[PDB]
């Protein structure tokens, strides 16, 4: 469909394609550095040692950054590697108390980012601590 | 039993603000070039979102701040390193210029005899000067940093496309006979935006985009008068706008490695700079906007377009700089009649407080020859001033609302690709 | 051998080298001076070329690995030679020109391989 | 049956564009290497690629457009913070020298009196300093004018800086790798064997010269003629010697120098009298050995020019001194030799003089310009040519006998010259093949 | 005992807290994300200070090619995933010739990394050559079938 | 038949030299958004901090080569600098002064300190220069050869007028480790500064510090810990100044008692001067208080650890400061934006077997030793007063004969390094190296 064709498909839709948004970032991070790196040649902008060029250093750093704090956080709930992982930390009905048929269909996930929203931090937490027991008990 | 499933690559985002980068074609000395040297992409695409409703807020969009602070910024960056005119504030002996002149233009020029670290002279508009105590100084002399810009620089307008960064995407509107606000049922993934033409102008929009078939009417409020009102016109008005006076330049040594580009006599005869626009087709442009004003109005009630208000030159005349010359058209000839070929002469000025700061200023250096300009007028600003009847005139000054007229179908987001749901599955 | 020294060396025995090739890939004032930028910079590329390609391994699945094994079949359409012509008497440079515009085809497949059986193991973990 | 296998690290590249950085030798305020950092490893490494034949294109090489960036940036960073000399840029009263001058240097020293400020505004003097005719521009009799007043914003160079060149060594980031030719008598543009990977080059250095090049390497075994397209006349021939040719320069003159306060704490340097006597500036090439090196080239020219034609030296057009003269620069000083006494031959120790200035308006460009300061003693350097940049004329008619003539001078030649043997590309490490096996 | 505080202990005692040094070490980037949410754009007056921010930014960068060093380390030898790893390389008596019980107990990690710095290279070599020989083993496997 | 193991996690570390990045408490930003240390330094440290202590490990430490000092010296510096560069430039003022006395109700002891100076101003029409005047210490104008005078620094460098509307009130900065590096500390009683280290506790940021700038005598520092300490790299060389830490701090009451105006002079277009303007009331002079038998106590203290080093039976003298500018002669100090020379003299005068020190006022400040920069600082309406701890001493020892029996110590230092030391000598930076082997009994 593209990038984001499946945005308004249904969660239980859209749980298909997730390679391409998943590939989409750093595939987009390194066409653009190339584009610009055999551009016709403007860097002598960036080599103006002003500050427009430390931002766009800058913006290619935090890039990065964000990246690798999704990564590095899969890799401590236990998830690297997948693009789907089960965690053993249940579901809270105070999150929410819709079922399963109710949400996965007639439902996209940018509305249920939003319903759910609030409790974000509430669940990254508990599937840290649910990573760390298991390392534990092995 | 249901457990918390973990998914990375889900299509969501959420509004947020970054720095778009700015990207060009190949044909482009001029102030943009250093700044949008990255290649538009040579075959843009967009993706369609089906089933997605977003929303947007044009008067809340940060594009447009960005644009505006990135245009200031340039053109500070190329006025920077160039000559600055302090050692002119010297008071001038100036003449009234009558050789050769028409009677709309007596008074207007002057010319200026003065003294330097040598005796010199040039001339200079009315409107550049003040009357002291034949002593004239310049209007801004000893207030502000009036410096003059680089002969070598074009200010032309060159289509631009600001482009998202990795990790963004820009959301476009394509709802015909958009608002600017709210819900917005289809919508297109964009890499980058169209061309726009960084143009500068007061009370009329020139060159952007045309609305598709209707006029439309968009601002913040559209009862408070208090808020500018945008109108997007579906079809372009000519006008033909001209500095028939064929002139010629100087140049003064002011100081050690300085220079001066002075105004010199004007060859023929002179005459007063102006525009043309069609009486019947401005006509019926107006009757257009009328149609559609009186929808938050009544369907009865009278509307009146009124010429001007009080303020400051560039707010009270429509203003635009076309061939790198100030015009200041005197547009009550187009706001003079109520509803239920128009020449438009024109002031010259070469100190130009560009964006309304107050401190500094730039010098337009003259242009040898004749300057003909032709170009499209595709909106208006309008502010709205018993019930039976309204009366509107023209605005503008606030540049945010120029950019708004072609940045108000995109927004920016960013992409989140992870999250989680239940579901009747455990490790 | 050493940092492509394999080069010259047949696509069988390069697969010797896998390890030192990849080996090479991630090699007190500081004040804003022309080459400080520059080195920067390069450092920052260095790191962003590197991710891309470690992404594209964990997609496909394989993360961690140097050699793997897919369930996508070999198409003929992308070359019908033999393993005889290609994993001898061929260098890996000679093969990669051999089928340079068939590059995304392939990983498309990978990816949507792998996607399968990621749907398929969280149904199996769903039996009970 | 054969599936698809992945594979990681896998010894294959492509043509790219990078991003370069500096490396040094550690032991070396000159502009060149102030924040180099990178030491080189003492001992570089070089990786033999058996069984690899490569493409290399000189003429298309992106590491010659990076080189010629990065020195351009520097220059313009050593004199961003240096003292401007706006202040110099007014009617200046000249007189010539006289006192004990040789024939060959009257009218090109002169002795020049100025009104200039002191440290406060308020305040002027009257000083002098000698010039060379070369940097000052006649008004209308006496009186003169900086060369570049009406033209450039001129900068003083900072005391106390080096030009010196000082080998740079590129190198590539992680992921990229240069590969280089050590293919025997290569002329750059097309394949080449015996290729290696290196992590960084060899030494380069920053030489700058115009018509002959002074201080790079040398072939090993034959002259080597290079040019993108030899029968098209409106491209450069670089000519590599195997051999180089000595050549002695010098400043004869014992100068001085004087310092004068201007502004708030702010130098300005100029020449001084000269003590002793005045002479011209020159450089000596030894003359068996420019013979000979001619010999060595025709010889090899002729292999695409004839063996019964005439091939001819002769002197370039007029134009520009940084066209016309042999320009380098020695301890900082800026020499403009004339080389008619070279290229007069027709096939089938020599004195040089020279001339000095100060106010440059480097790298093809109008401005900005700098100004060098005097150095103070006597300089002598000794330097090695090897290879010279020749162009050549129409040969339409009567084409049995063509001339070869200095020229080019664009600054991108002077290094090509070194980085012809050397091509970036990037590392690939991923691929696929078909195999037998299965998840 | 907190980040560290097994630094006293000897190797053997010391290795039963190596969860809570990776956990600190492993969390750096999402802990200075959430740092970043603390102060919202106060970067904005850091990004005006040029030299402040390039060392700051030269910092930024390594800490995460330090983190993507060892993982790459660890991915290569097969100890992917895993603070505790046995491979395949035999020990020499070279590189240390004292008995198990004299190594695991009365020595900290830190003696014990000074007894060995020489041989780390040779050892990295051998861990990563063995990995990829049992690579090739699980290919034929596979293939076998 | 043992094998390779490898593990990951191993509380293993090595001395490194990093750039740390500065941290502050984040109230102090929000309360006030002017101060340079607030503005940059913006990131929040842990409002709750954790020390963990090391047990059974020794370090060493050597605070006179710690890089931790060396970093945070540049920064000072750096952000310094960047604060003065966007600010008015004076460079139209490096004109002919002409200048007589002030001698309007004076007191004795300030005839001739201050002076009444005028000089013609062309900010208009580039003609119809205006006479103006203004205030001026006497420490800032030199006179030229009877009324001529200019402003010091005209032969060395402009002058950039500091910005009104920029703080440089010191408050408490932290230094903190970034990921994949740790601070070590050094609690023992009575440290050296140097050597092993006993008791060694693992720490993300240092305790604040304010970045106090001061020569002579330190202020608003830490408290040595039940002893009086005194330290330094080599205690037997005269060659290196001894830094004396206190256990009990000394107040001190600082004031410059005349009631200032000031005259807003335009030298351009957005280009404004600050000047001194006339001064309200009479003119005594500035000066500050100490308790004299605090003060005695205090070194009696220092005097009888001093001895440690040099016997029982031997004389230790105090003595004032050797010649030299105002930076290294004078106690120096930065008072309500306004920068004081303090005169020690009457501090350092006593031999062992209300104290009032009269001070000066400079408006050109030539700061940190350097040559070729310098600040104007603009006049503070009203009257300054300052009550601060003396947190130390800064002695140096002096050369003598032989065997003088007799050892004399004066007020020395003025390398700002040393005030940074003083501080951050309790800290080392070391990196974690994680990932490493060790012989086993397992495989896969
Ligand atoms: C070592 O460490 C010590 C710290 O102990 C250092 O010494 C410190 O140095 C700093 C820096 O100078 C200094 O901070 C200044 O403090 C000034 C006054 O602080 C007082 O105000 C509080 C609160 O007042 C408010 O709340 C009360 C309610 O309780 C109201 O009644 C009141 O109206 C007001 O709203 C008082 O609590 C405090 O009381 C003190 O107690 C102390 C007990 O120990 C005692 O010692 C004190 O003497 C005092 O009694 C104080 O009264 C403050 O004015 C300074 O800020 C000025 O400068 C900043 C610059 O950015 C301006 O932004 C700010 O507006 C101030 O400028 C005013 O004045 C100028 C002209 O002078 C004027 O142009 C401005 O407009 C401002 O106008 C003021 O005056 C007007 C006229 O009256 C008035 O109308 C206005 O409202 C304004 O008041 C600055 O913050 C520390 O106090 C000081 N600490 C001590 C103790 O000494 C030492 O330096 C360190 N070591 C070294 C040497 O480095
Ligand atoms: C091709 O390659 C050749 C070979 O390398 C190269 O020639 C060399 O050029 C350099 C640069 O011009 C020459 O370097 C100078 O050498 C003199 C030698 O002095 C003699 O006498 C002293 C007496 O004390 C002895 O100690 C010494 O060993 C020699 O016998 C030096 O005096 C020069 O130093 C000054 O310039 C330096 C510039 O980098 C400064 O860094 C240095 O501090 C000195 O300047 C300061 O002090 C001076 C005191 O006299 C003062 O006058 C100055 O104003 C300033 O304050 C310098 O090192 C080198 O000798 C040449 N080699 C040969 C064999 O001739 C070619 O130039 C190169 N060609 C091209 C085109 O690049
Ligand atoms: C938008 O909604 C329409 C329905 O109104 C979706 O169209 C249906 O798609 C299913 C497959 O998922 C087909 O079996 C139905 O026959 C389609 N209905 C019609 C009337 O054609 C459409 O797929 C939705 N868009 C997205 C992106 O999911
Ligand atoms: C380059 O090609 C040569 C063959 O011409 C390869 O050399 C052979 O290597 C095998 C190794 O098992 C020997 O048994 C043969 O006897 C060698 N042949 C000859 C003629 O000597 C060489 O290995 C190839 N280069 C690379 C890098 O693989
Ligand atoms: C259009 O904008 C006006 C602004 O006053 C608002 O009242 C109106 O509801 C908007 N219409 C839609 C369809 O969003
Ligand atoms: C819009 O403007 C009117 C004034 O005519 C005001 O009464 C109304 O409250 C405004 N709408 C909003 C957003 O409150
Ligand atoms: C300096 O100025 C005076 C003005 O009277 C002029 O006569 C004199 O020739 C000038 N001197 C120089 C060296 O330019
Ligand atoms: C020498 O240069 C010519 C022209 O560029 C080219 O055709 C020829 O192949 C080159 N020689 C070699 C050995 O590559
Ligand atoms: C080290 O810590 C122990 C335990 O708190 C204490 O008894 C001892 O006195 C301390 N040593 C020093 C030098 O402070
Ligand atoms: C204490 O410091 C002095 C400084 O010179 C040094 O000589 C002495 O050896 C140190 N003592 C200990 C126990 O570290």
Partial sequence: ?138 | NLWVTVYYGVPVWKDAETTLFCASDAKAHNVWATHCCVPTDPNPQEIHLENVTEEFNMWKNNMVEQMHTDIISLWDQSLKPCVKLTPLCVTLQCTNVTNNITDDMRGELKNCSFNMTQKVYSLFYRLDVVQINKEYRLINCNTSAITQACPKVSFEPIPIHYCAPAGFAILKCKDKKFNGTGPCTNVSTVQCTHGIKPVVSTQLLLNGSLAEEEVIIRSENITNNAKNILVQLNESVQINCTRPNNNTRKSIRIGPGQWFYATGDIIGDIRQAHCNVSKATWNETLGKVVKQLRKHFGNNTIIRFANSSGGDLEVTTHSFNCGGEFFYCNTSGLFNSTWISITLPCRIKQIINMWQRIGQAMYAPPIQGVIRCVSNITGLILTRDNSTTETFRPGGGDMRDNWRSELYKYKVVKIEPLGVAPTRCKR
């Fill in chain 1, 1 to 138: 469909l593209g990038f984001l064709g499946a945005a308004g498909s249904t969660m239980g839709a859209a749980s298909m394609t997730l390679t391409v948004q998943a590939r989409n970032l750093l595939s987009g991070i390194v066409q653009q550095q190339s584009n610009l790196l055999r551009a016709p040649e403007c860097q002598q902008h960036l080599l103006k040692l002003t500050v427009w060029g430390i931002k766009q250093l800058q913006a290619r750093v935090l890039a990065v950054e964000r990246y690798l704090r999704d990564q590095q956080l899969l890799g401590i709930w236990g998830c690297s590697g997948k693009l789907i992982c089960c965690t053993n930390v249940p579901w809270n009905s105070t999150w929410s108390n819709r079922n399963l048929s109710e949400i996965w269909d007639n439902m996209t996930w940018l509305q249920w980012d939003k319903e759910i929203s609030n409790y974000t931090q509430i669940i990254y937490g508990l599937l840290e601590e649910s990573q760390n027991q298991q390392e534990k008990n092995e």
